[PDB]
């Protein structure tokens, strides 16, 4: 059902031309990290605007489970990222890299337009826990792929205001501007 999203993206994400939907791609990934905060697992969220106009969102939560899911026969993480949520962002990204830190292991999966390049795979060790999503918006969906500091800042000011416990770091690599927002 990522096909449905790719076919009619306006209906899932918002306007693909005026910047509204492009920024909502970020809002949606961040909202998943806020869920992890609200559940009590996440105190810190990092959002980075890369020089190539891609986005990294990183949290210090539990990390999405990696265990094979009985029904699909793939990792729970893959299910979450591919089956209609964040799976919309995946569908509308030409490239998305998921990195999970969980039970002292680093796991990654790369998708193209939501299709996994490979099954979730072990790549390192870690003493941290949490979830990192890097995505590159598809230029077949979006025109004028240019993120706005002001738009993401406003959203984070909202999230920070409404969730006084969470520390949210915005970094713009294009300008080097950073700000930690925490009420
Ligand atoms: C950037 C970012 N961070 C997260 C994120 O941390 N989410 C986590 N979800 C869980 C969790 O529920 C899974 C099985 C689930 C998620 C959504 C819908 C249905 C099911 C279970 C557990 C657990 O049992 O330990 C941990 C996590 S962490 C997402 Cl999603 C995104 Cl995007």
Numbering used by the authors: 17 to 100, 121 to 219
From the manuscript:
Bacterial DNA gyrase and DNA topoisomerase IV (topo IV), both type II topoisomerases, responsible for the ATP-driven introduction of negative supercoils into DNA and ATP-driven supercoil relaxation and decatenation, respectively, are validated antibacterial targets. Gyrase is a heterotetramer of GyrA and GyrB subunits (A2B2), while topo IV is a heterotetramer of ParC and ParE subunits (C2E2). We have developed compounds with a promising activity against Acinetobacter baumannii and Pseudomonas aeruginosa, which are both on the WHO priority list of antibiotic-resistant bacteria. Cocrystal structures of 1 in complex with Escherichia coli GyrB24 and (S)-27 in complex with A. baumannii GyrB23 and P. aeruginosa GyrB24 revealed their binding to the ATP-binding pocket of the GyrB subunit.
The pyrrolamide moiety is bound in the lipophilic pocket and interacts with Val43, Val73, Met97, Val122, and Val169. Important interactions are hydrogen bonds formed with Asp87 in A. baumannii (Asp73 in E. coli, Asp75 in P. aeruginosa), the conserved water molecule, Asn60 in A. baumannii (Asn46 in E. coli, Asn48 in P. aeruginosa), Gly 95 in A. baumannii (Gly81 in E. coli, Asp83 in P. aeruginosa), and Arg150 in A. baumannii (Arg136 in E. coli, Asp138 in P. aeruginosa) as well as cation−π stacking with Arg90 in A. baumannii (Arg76 in E. coli, Arg78 in P. aeruginosa). While retaining excellent in vitro activity against A. baumannii, compound 27 also displayed improved activity against P. aeruginosa, possibly due to a 10-fold stronger inhibition of topo IV and more balanced inhibition of both DNA gyrase and topo IV. Whereas for 1 there was no killing of P. aeruginosa up to 8-fold MIC, compound 27 was bacteriostatic with an MIC of 2 μg/mL. Whereas in 1 MICs against P. aeruginosa increased significantly, up to 32 μg/mL, as bacterial cell concentration increased, compound 27 did not show any MIC dependence on the inoculum size in P. aeruginosa.
